[PDB]
Design a protein around this ligand. Structure first.
Ligand SMILES: Cc1cc2nc3c(=O)[nH]c(=O)nc-3n(C[C@H](O)[C@H](O)[C@H](O)COP(=O)(O)OP(=O)(O)OC[C@H]3O[C@@H](n4cnc5c(N)ncnc54)[C@@H](O)[C@@H]3O)c2cc1C
Ligand code: HEM
Ligand code: HEM
Ligand code: HEM
Ligand code: HEM
Ligand SMILES: O=C(O)/C=C/C(=O)O
Ligand code: NA
Length: 568
């Protein structure tokens, strides 16, 4: 057979997959996926039959209920979603090579005939609020608006939920929480505000940073009430004390937070629509929001009538062409991001009259795996790892800010460096076992053996770790002035991970006020239009602190949903 449908129709009728009249159920293909499951079992049941030692197409870190049609199309060849970040040895029937080629908002202007036809028709739905994007900010706004009495529709352009938020690792910043107190940590909202402004080179909007610090404990409390585990509290770069909250034992914060938000949306029967892209905010004769034009992958163009639209579409760090025009020093770099993080939401905002700010400030993460091409968490360093060069020496304070850390690594022989750690560090942060499973953390029972394996001077490496351990014992790093020295590297075996910088987070974006209301270039509010999360500018100034994005998306998402409900 040339395709999956052709295979099935050898022994099955059309209505084995389809509704009675043949029409597709909706853009999520709810009915059609139900039929796959009726014969093959759930995703978990299928996974029992496709196990490899270290990977499984049908059992991954993705949260929510991943639809079969995300990867298996019926009437044409289709792509394995995992191929957008990894290169596992797969043999999916009727596969083709991964390629993402999504038209820009401007390119879609050529659908004049089809768009005018849609706008001339009745609205397909009439509701209170539409939320655009199923990351942390979007789920938070949808839940908070619903709890405030509003009827919501939540849309996602990708086949899967979660955006970049489902990938988050190191933690969510807050002060001064019950969780911190239980771990004998002393902190304050004031100290979090001070650290944040200093980190951003004092470019941040202070009114927006005040919302970030003052609402941070409430946001940890809100997630915890909904079922989240945020009880482990670690250190990240630029923080005066430990304040990065994550699950027990040091597991990833992102996939967990998104799973909790998804379960809470399902509990409330929130209308969530996959493969549905927001195209154009609609405004009335007086310039207030009246609805939104969307494009369903399967059902085509239609519009929704609503009082308010909340843009929660994330950043543009995957789009290297756009990145390079704003910061040429990042041209040609790899990125940490999901394949859809290209900035189309910003285009939607500008077309509706919203102004942008701080767009020139773009963050590289200092430690992506050279071998696997994925983010390796800053929490590996926070919990005690060091960095060495090919000469086997330390060369930087491992918990300095991200710009200086990236510059330092690129200045070393080969434009990369190695994370070095032991079994005490490994046991303190369960996320590390994920890098070991991926095959990117080679190991040996001595540093001489490990250096020989990886091309690091073995004698120098050995002396480097002995010296560092002496500095830990004495309590002061006289070599690089690292201010936090949590563990000696001296238990069990040793590990190395080769690392290099990659494009990560876009600090700029749409201009909002403290009520998450979008403003134009004259600083006038556009009535009914809101923005929340990485799509916004002004919160993080010239440089974002590790842990501050997950804090931002829950706080600003929740407040946007409440304000939109009140407005409606
Ligand atoms: C690997 C990785 C690890 C990270 N770890 C951390 C961490 O530990 N701590 C931390 O604080 N930050 C971390 N960050 C940063 C943080 O996760 C992101 O800033 C966060 O994902 C921003 O959330 P969001 O809701 O604004 O956007 P996202 O989570 O990116 O969600 C936006 C969604 O909207 C969509 N969308 C876009 N345009 C449209 C459209 N036109 N119509 C419909 N849908 C649209 C999507 O495709 C995407 O699903 C990490 C980022 C990465 C990439
Ligand atoms: C729904 C759209 C759906 C999908 C997706 C799906 C997957 C799938 C694959 C990938 C194969 C392997 C094909 C090959 O070897 O070339 C396969 C094969 C079988 N299927 Fe299926 N399947 C979907 C839907 C359905 C439904 C609705 C039925 C039954 C009415 C069904 C059953 C079968 C059977 C039988 C096979 C042959 C292998 C076997 O398990 O005996 N599937 N399917
Ligand atoms: C949804 C629940 C779903 C079903 C059903 C399904 C079916 C399916 C079959 C029957 C096979 C062949 C199994 C066999 O050889 O006996 C198969 C194989 C692969 N699939 Fe699948 N699949 C479902 C969902 C998904 C999704 C969401 C993805 C991508 C994230 C995906 C991809 C793959 C891949 C890759 C394979 C080959 C596996 C391997 O080589 O190890 N499927 N699927
Ligand atoms: C039986 C021979 C059969 C027919 C006929 C048929 C038709 C059909 C059409 C016309 C579409 C497109 C509809 C639109 O664009 O509005 C479509 C799309 C999908 N189908 Fe189908 N289809 C037949 C058989 C089957 C079988 C056996 C399956 C499942 C294994 C199946 C499923 C799907 C799915 C999923 C889609 C969405 C697009 C895609 O994945 O290709 N159909 N079909
Ligand atoms: C697609 C559904 C998919 C699968 C399957 C998959 C697997 C996978 C494995 C086996 C690992 C090693 C650790 C583990 O066993 O969980 C791993 C690690 C990371 N991945 Fe992944 N992955 C899939 C898809 C994607 C995509 C599309 C991205 C990027 C947008 C991505 C990212 C990452 C990252 C980062 C890691 C590092 C470990 C961690 O952060 O947990 N994956 N993945
Ligand atoms: O865990 C990390 O390294 C990333 C943190 C962040 O971007 O905030
Ligand atoms: Na931003």
């Amino acid at each position: 057979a040339d395709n999956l449908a052709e295979f099935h129709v050898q022994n099955q009728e059309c209505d084995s997959c389809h509704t009675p009249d043949g029409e597709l159920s909706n853009d999520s293909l709810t009915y059609e996926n139900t039929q796959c499951v009726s014969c093959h079992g759930t995703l978990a049941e299928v996974a029992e039959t496709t196990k490899h030692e270290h990977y499984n197409a049908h059992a991954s870190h993705f949260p929510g209920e991943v639809a079969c049609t995300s990867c298996h199309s019926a009437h044409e060849k289709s792509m394995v979603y995992c191929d957008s970040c990894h290169s596992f040895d797969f043999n999916m029937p009727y596969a083709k090579k991964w390629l993402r080629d999504e038209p820009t908002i401007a390119e879609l202007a050529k659908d004049k005939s089809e768009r005018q036809a849609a706008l001339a028709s009745a609205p397909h739905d009439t509701v209170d609020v539409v939320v655009v994007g199923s990351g942390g900010a979007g789920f938070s706004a949808a839940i908070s608006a619903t709890d405030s009495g509003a009827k919501v529709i939540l849309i996602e352009k990708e086949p899967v939920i979660g955006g970049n938020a489902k990938l988050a690792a190191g933690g969510m910043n807050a002060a001064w929480t019950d969780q911190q107190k239980a771990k004998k940590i002393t902190d304050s909202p004031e100290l979090m505000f001070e650290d944040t402004m200093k980190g951003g080179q004092n470019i941040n909007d202070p009114a927006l940073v005040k919302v970030l610090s003052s609402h941070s404990k409430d946001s940890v409390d809100w997630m915890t009430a909904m079922g989240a585990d945020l009880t482990d509290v670690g250190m990240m770069g630029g923080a005066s004390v430990n304040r990065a909250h994550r699950p027990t034992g040091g597991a990833g914060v992102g996939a967990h937070v998104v799973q909790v938000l998804y379960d809470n949306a399902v509990k409330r029967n929130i209308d969530l629509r996959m493969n549905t892209r927001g195209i154009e905010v609609l405004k009335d004769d007086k310039g207030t929001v009246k609805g939104i034009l969307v494009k369903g992958m399967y059902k085509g163009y239609y519009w929704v009538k609503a009082d308010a639209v909340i843009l929660a579409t994330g950043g543009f760090a995957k789009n290297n062409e756009r990145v390079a025009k704003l910061d040429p020093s990042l041209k040609g770099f790899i990125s940490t991001n999901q394949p859809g993080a290209v900035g189309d939401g910003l285009d939607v905002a500008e077309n509706a009259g919203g102004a942008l700010k701080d767009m020139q400030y773009i963050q590289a993460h200092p430690t992506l795996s050279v071998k696997g091409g994925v983010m390796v968490t800053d929490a590996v360093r926070g919990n005690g790892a060091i960095l060495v060069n090919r000469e086997g020496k330390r060369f930087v304070n491992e918990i300095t800010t991200r710009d200086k850390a990236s510059a330092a690594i690129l200045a070393q022989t080969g434009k990369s460096a190695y994370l070095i750690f032991d079994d005490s560090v490994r046991k303190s942060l369960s996320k590390i076992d994920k890098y070991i499973g991926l095959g990117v953390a080679p190991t040996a029972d001595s540093l001489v053996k490990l250096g020989k394996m990886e091309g690091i001077d073995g004698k120098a490496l050995t002396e480097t770790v002995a010296r560092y351990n002496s500095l830990v014992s004495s309590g002061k790093d006289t070599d690089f002035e690292r201010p936090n020295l949590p563990r000696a590297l001296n238990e069990g075996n040793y590990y190395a991970i080769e690392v290099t910088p990659g494009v990560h987070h876009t600090m700029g974006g749409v201009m909002i006020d403290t009520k998450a209301e979008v403003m134009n270039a004259k600083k006038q509010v556009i009535p009914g239009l809101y923005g929340a999360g990485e799509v916004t500018g002004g919160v993080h100034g010239a440089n974002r602190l590790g842990g501050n994005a997950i804090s931002d998306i829950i706080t600003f998402g929740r407040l946007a949903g409440e304000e939109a409900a009140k407005y409606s």
